[PDB]
Design a protein around this ligand. Sequence first.
Ligand SMILES: *[C@@H]1O[C@H](CO)[C@@H](O)[C@H](O)[C@H]1NC(C)=O
Ligand SMILES: *[C@@H]1O[C@H](CO)[C@@H](O)[C@H](O)[C@H]1NC(C)=O
Ligand SMILES: *[C@@H]1O[C@H](CO)[C@@H](O)[C@H](O)[C@H]1NC(C)=O
Ligand SMILES: *[C@@H]1O[C@H](CO)[C@@H](O)[C@H](O)[C@H]1NC(C)=O
Lengths: 497, 497, 497, 497
Amino acid sequence: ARPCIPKSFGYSSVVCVCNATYCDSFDPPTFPALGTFSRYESTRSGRRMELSMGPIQANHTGTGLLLTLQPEQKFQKVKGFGGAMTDAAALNILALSPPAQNLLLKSYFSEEGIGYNIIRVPMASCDFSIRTYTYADTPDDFQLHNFSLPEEDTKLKIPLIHRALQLAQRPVSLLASPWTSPTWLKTNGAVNGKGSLKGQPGDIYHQTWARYFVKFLDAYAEHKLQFWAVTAENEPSAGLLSGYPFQCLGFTPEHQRDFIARDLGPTLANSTHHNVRLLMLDDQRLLLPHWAKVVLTDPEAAKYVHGIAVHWYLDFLAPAKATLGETHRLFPNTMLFASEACVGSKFWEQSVRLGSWDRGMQYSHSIITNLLYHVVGWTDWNLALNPEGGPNWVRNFVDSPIIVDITKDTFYKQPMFYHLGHFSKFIPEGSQRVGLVASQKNDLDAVALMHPDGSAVVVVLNRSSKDVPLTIKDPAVGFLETISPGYSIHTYLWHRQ
Amino acid sequence: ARPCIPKSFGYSSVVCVCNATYCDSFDPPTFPALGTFSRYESTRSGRRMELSMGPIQANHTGTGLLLTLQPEQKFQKVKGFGGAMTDAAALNILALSPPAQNLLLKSYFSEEGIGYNIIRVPMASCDFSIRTYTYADTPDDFQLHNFSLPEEDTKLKIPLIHRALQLAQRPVSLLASPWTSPTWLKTNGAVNGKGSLKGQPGDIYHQTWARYFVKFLDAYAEHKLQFWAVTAENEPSAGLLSGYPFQCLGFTPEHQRDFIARDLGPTLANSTHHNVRLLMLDDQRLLLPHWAKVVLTDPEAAKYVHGIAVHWYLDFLAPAKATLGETHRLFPNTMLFASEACVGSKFWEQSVRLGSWDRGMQYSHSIITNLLYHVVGWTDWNLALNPEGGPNWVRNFVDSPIIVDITKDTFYKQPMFYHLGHFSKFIPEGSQRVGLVASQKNDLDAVALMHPDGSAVVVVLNRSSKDVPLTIKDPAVGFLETISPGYSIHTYLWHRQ
Amino acid sequence: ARPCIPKSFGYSSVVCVCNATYCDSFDPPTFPALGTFSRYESTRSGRRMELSMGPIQANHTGTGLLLTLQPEQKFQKVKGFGGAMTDAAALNILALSPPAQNLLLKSYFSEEGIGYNIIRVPMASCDFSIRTYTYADTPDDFQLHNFSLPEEDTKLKIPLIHRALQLAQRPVSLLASPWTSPTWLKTNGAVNGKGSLKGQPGDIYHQTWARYFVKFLDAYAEHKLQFWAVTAENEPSAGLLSGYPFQCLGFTPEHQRDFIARDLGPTLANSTHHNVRLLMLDDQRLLLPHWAKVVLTDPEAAKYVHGIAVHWYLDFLAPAKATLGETHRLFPNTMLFASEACVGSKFWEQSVRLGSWDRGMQYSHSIITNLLYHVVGWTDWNLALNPEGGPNWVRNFVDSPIIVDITKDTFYKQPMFYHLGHFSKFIPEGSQRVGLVASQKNDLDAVALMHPDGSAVVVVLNRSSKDVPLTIKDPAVGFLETISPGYSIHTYLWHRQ
Amino acid sequence: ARPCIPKSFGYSSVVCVCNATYCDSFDPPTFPALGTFSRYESTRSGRRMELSMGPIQANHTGTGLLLTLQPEQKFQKVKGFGGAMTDAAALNILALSPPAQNLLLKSYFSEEGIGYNIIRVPMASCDFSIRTYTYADTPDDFQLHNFSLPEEDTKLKIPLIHRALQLAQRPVSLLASPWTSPTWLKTNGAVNGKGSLKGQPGDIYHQTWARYFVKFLDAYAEHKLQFWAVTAENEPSAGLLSGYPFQCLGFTPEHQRDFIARDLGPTLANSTHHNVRLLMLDDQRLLLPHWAKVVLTDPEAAKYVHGIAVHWYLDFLAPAKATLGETHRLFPNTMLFASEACVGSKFWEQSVRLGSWDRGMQYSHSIITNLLYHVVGWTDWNLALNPEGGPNWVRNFVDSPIIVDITKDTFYKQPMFYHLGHFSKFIPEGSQRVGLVASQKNDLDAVALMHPDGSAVVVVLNRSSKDVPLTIKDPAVGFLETISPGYSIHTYLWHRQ
Ligand SMILES: *[C@@H]1O[C@H](CO)[C@@H](O)[C@H](O)[C@H]1NC(C)=O
Ligand SMILES: *[C@@H]1O[C@H](CO)[C@@H](O)[C@H](O)[C@H]1NC(C)=O
Ligand SMILES: *[C@@H]1O[C@H](CO)[C@@H](O)[C@H](O)[C@H]1NC(C)=O
Ligand SMILES: *[C@@H]1O[C@H](CO)[C@@H](O)[C@H](O)[C@H]1NC(C)=O
């Protein structure tokens, strides 16, 4: 419906510029007529999820690369894609004028945008907040009588989640994660630094912390929001480190295991929120498979754990078979779910590199690796940041796919936004990853899935500077003859019957 | 009645620790017979507004510096002393338990505290707000039917003010200042950045803005609050600087003049709040004499201006004589008032330094200089901040006399608080600055005033490391022999008959 | 002449991109024919010192703004224009490939560039150094036996200065300033923080320090480099402030006075380098006229002082007449010289803002202001910086007219470069400022000078958005009919016979 | 012989203060009769390589953890331990007065110190250099006639290396790594950033690069220095990261393979320095086993490779078993060597922390892990750094075992330094690692080795806060009853015959 307005800031590619009256969008989604394929294309030269259609042909000859769909090699089913409603993201989007906010929420949540169906909601404050608070800052308040949501929740976060869900046709899943407990529950009595819960699992500190999860859920339910899942703690391993600079709460894998079996599991079960799922870990994938073994080989903790949540800082490089693979082999029936990714910890590069196609490729390459290793969903960090990559109370800034320029009442959709959307738009909940065999080694990243309805979706990333001719075989329909240009990403869609 | 409990944070002096059940306080004011003085003393070494008495004797044993009171040499009368009830300050005070809230408010407003009689109230949001916002965010409501107070006003600020004035013996004067207008009244359509009101004084926008002041004053009146005065805009020169980060609204001196002439003055006059004073500038003193010349050398703007509000922030750029001194000479009948009497801090320093005696010595030095250059009143910035100098939705650069640690239900009284109190507690409204002649060049800062009742008040600041032997002469009573210790501030008080 | 290659980075204007093979340049300078004027134009829209020529008319009618030259009202003679060869500057330039370096040095020092004839040299380390050092770091070395220049001088700074002088057709004048003494000459024993020279003027500390100036001079002399002037100390006021974060040495005006009278004056006088001039102050003009009074009303110190060096941080708009004016009036025979200026506090935006036209206008506006107040010279801070605005060992980054991108082997010439060039290219040493009378009130900044050969030069800056038609009147020749477009800068040059 | 002089800087432990006349040292090694052990102990509490002796008894009086020496399971033989003589380290050493220089050099290199036997020597500049430079910076010297060593080599590094080897008992092995080639060999003509060599293995550029290694070695031989080994490139994977800030030269594993195969190997073989060993990777352990699989499964490449060099950056991203363990299995005859066995510093901590015991433990823990995974040698990063972690021409990022204060002619020996000496002092070249079996799960890190003379060394690290009672059995001699105190590291030494 509306094309990208490109703007350069001197990096490898362009941003798309949005304001109160204009934002790039899509027409309502239609399926390609049987015997044809749809293609979406984003490129470094500046194409943005641009649509074409082509023929599915009956024959193929040649010694070029062929990707062959294996429709009966069925893997993980998809939960979905989204990002986080942090204090910072909330503050930024509401600093835009009301029509700009709506254009921004449409970009992510609407069918005319990229169909996000996950929103991660911090339980009180994190580094991406402009102050440090909890829901229970009255010292020693074991009954949680002074539990309340600050304006950050009731003025900024909640209203925006309501608006986001309104704009979405897909059911949206809310995920919650706490960074810290009240300081009076903690051995070190602070929001940061080294420290865990006081006492032993089973006891008043552990029981009050469990109950705070339930109060959180109650108070969001008062505002007509329900959660799909909660995590046991954001980055439990961070509060094990002396001088950790922002909000944290340390657990060893053993302490997490015991908290869940002794406190958190039974407490959620006994509540009216018992259908909310629980996810362990919520941390670096390098901590796998050990964390999962400690927790899940204890049937008392296992009964209560729906899934394993993993983080990744994309500026680094951890292998995936060692961690996601082994974890899946050890516990095939416990879902693997990526709850946070970000880039921009890059030290020679600033926090926000406006228009960076490299950071775009980092994202889609990470999504593909995750889908290739059983991961069922993928969640970005902050939904929106400023040109500095904040606000952040500890100046630990990072990139975000949307950047808000408040003085200009404009936002910028970076290549990260489009590289995310090549998945989120075309891979609905229930999509099932299926096999796809390459006929010769190549430099391309590829993944195939089938929608609930039975149709095919393939994403292909080209992180090289050379164009790659390739054909995709679907034995039900024929061949799609295409080229993957260097520095492009494609989504291919077709009906199979 | 209760002494300071000292705590060191590794800076040059101490804070006084207060909590829900304890805070340092004063006995009611009780002053002695003719021929005796009262001294209140604060030292870097740890004394905090400590009281003693001594004689005023017929003969002179001092051979060093002599300050002679000259009651017949009469200057300006004093409006008073206070600070700002910003969203930040209100949120911080209200994060304490009720009894703690009361000790903090008594610390400022009661006679058992330091006797504040002025409160500055922002009109909607500033940087010291957790969110951007105005009282009229619905676009094109030129009649402001949609005008209202959010929760920041009706929940935080308004009851805290009601409680401030219950606690106070002296009448409290309220002062309002806007930071930004609704953004649909603005050129740049943004809450911050370079931009002014749309079009020309007299037009549809300039008139709606003027009516906004009336709507603000009305809304506070429904809540039983009356204002002493308003500023025409907070820091109007700021919103002429491209992408200024905070809520701003740009006026040139000429634009301010015409808005007052054509719109603000005429509208306020035609209202039921015609008694509310109008203050121009509200900005760095470096902009004087010029700003005053532009606005006040126009009879139709000048007839509407009671005063000139000034900020201390950038005092070091332009000196007192050339700015305040010169302005008074040209416009001797328009009062000078320090409306945002606040600090720096320093590029290489933290916003909040707990126990910084320097930051205190800066406060008193600056109040003295002001007093010596015709200034009638002083309004500090935020009443309280958190230990990070927040919350500020942009970035915190400033300290505050009271720092709240919400996690501990404790608040800290900085040296700045006592430095302020050496003036505010003992210079009531209507006190007149009188002469005080040094006999020889010296390093003290000193100022003398006479209370409405005729009794003498003298402040001696020793910003140096060395004890200074001092005599104070009153022609009518005799000689007060004393010592001004290095890094001390003293207030002397005595009956004159 | 090779024209500018424009690039945007999202700011108000473009930069000019240079590399190993291409840099925008000028043709050799030509006098315009008698009866015609030369114009050089730079605009926000993207013109960079474009040459045009027009006619000098015999008469004029209007109404319009008329700037009238007063050839016989003669003011200050110009010393010149240039910038600082810091460690940061030099490390950056030498990180370019040999051919790129030369294009950068040509830009500044060549007649085919912008004609710089000042280079300010730090005497050892400053904040724009990647380590701290002095030339005499052996403790208690009073004889200065281990005085030596490091590679920072011998490998980076010196060879670049040689190459700059080689490229220049004009005589270049070198100006040296120290930030710190050896730590064993200081009271606090550190390169930074609050502290002065130990002992009293006249003693071994003060003598050794004076002899260090001579040793510096000797060492630069062995490398065939001769100095025009030395400052008594960079920002003497800075060493008076506890916690001052980088290299400093504190002098009160009195200590500076006496150091000069007792030590630095006689020592330089007794040396072979007695022809090198001594400039006092080297700090902000807010310190004036007081510093000058204190130093210069002492004939023992006055006899040794050739000039007053002044700094301005351009983000702090503060006047002007009260400092530079009052100073010239008191000491008409002691030149004022601007020895350092920089932009980039704007805490709302970066150190570096690639393509900022605003920062360009701050430079030229400050040069006009200076020139209209008797100032004979203007020196920029760092010649070149990286995109972060360093390196700087204390992260005190600022903007620079040339920015080096080392990974690209490219340098960007910001609008600050050209805004400076409108002066340095066209006002040689010896030029005399003359009168220029505006016929009516106007928003333009303007300044007229006469070249040593009798020809005129006028710079006109338009900082408003509106085009201003205007005529320049010279009695010798007639009228120049022209327009000043909004956000533009022009230099006009004509022969007067 | 001389004890540690301790100084605290507010971190968890102390540094040992050394100056021109005083440094801690050891007595000449002296080992007791069969049945007696020697123990060196360092504690966070303050003990530094403190010596005591004790018996090896017939009866077992302990009932806790038992460690049994298994001299018959024999593993890798040890090459040695050392650090890098960077420009920065040479800087930093040479700013000290000669006597102080020598005490620093004995600290590392003599038997009265910690007996270093490896130095890593960068080939031209790296980040720890005060300028960028290579040895052939004049373009189109394809035959390298203008190849020369600058002053950093001939003035700083080489004389220091000479002096190190005079001081050393043991033969010292020199290891050379290039960071960057001449820029006119690089795709990008920049010293840093994304860029590899130009063209293809075999061509003019690759042949010149390879001859550069021979000219480098040639030049060092005229200075009477010869090398043990070179690495093919320092950190090749970083030259693939866009805008990489440090000196670099990108190689994919396939490219390194081909450059070793076609150029580097053949060229070194044909030369007079054919006995110089060649190590591959020189990069993070996460890159393994893959990197190794690419280069070593090609007999044209592998006939030319002696070892695999790894960095400890970046170790947290990958575990030992999966990388080092798995690489040993696949290629059991290619030795693993830690070439840059250094930090790195947590995003929120300073580069240098004086007295950080935790950083010390990080070192010894990591040397232990390495030894338990077949690693034969170590090179720490910079030998010395200034208290800022410099000079680094890009960014001060890491700590160094010795920190040098040039202002005070004093140097500080950090905990890291004694943790290193617990190994380097007592593990001579040719020591072979042996079995050391734990009787039960425990928390100590322990490794046993056999000297070339068949005597025993065991290092025990206790990273916990609690004392652990410990017995060590040697089947041949008996039982050593001991305690590993919390936060301690022990070295045990005994004859077995
Ligand atoms: C925003 O939208 C489009 C951008 O292409 C443009 O035509 C319009 O001028 C812009 N509007 C504002 C309010 O800046
Ligand atoms: C409040 O302060 C008083 C005076 O220091 C003290 O006795 C009391 O313990 C404090 N309250 C708490 C809960 O610490
Ligand atoms: C340098 O810039 C010129 C002019 O824009 C361009 O044509 C040339 O290719 C550039 N060279 C390099 C090495 O980037
Ligand atoms: C060197 O150190 C020793 C022992 O700490 C000390 O006695 C001596 O004063 C030191 N030398 C100097 C110049 O301080």
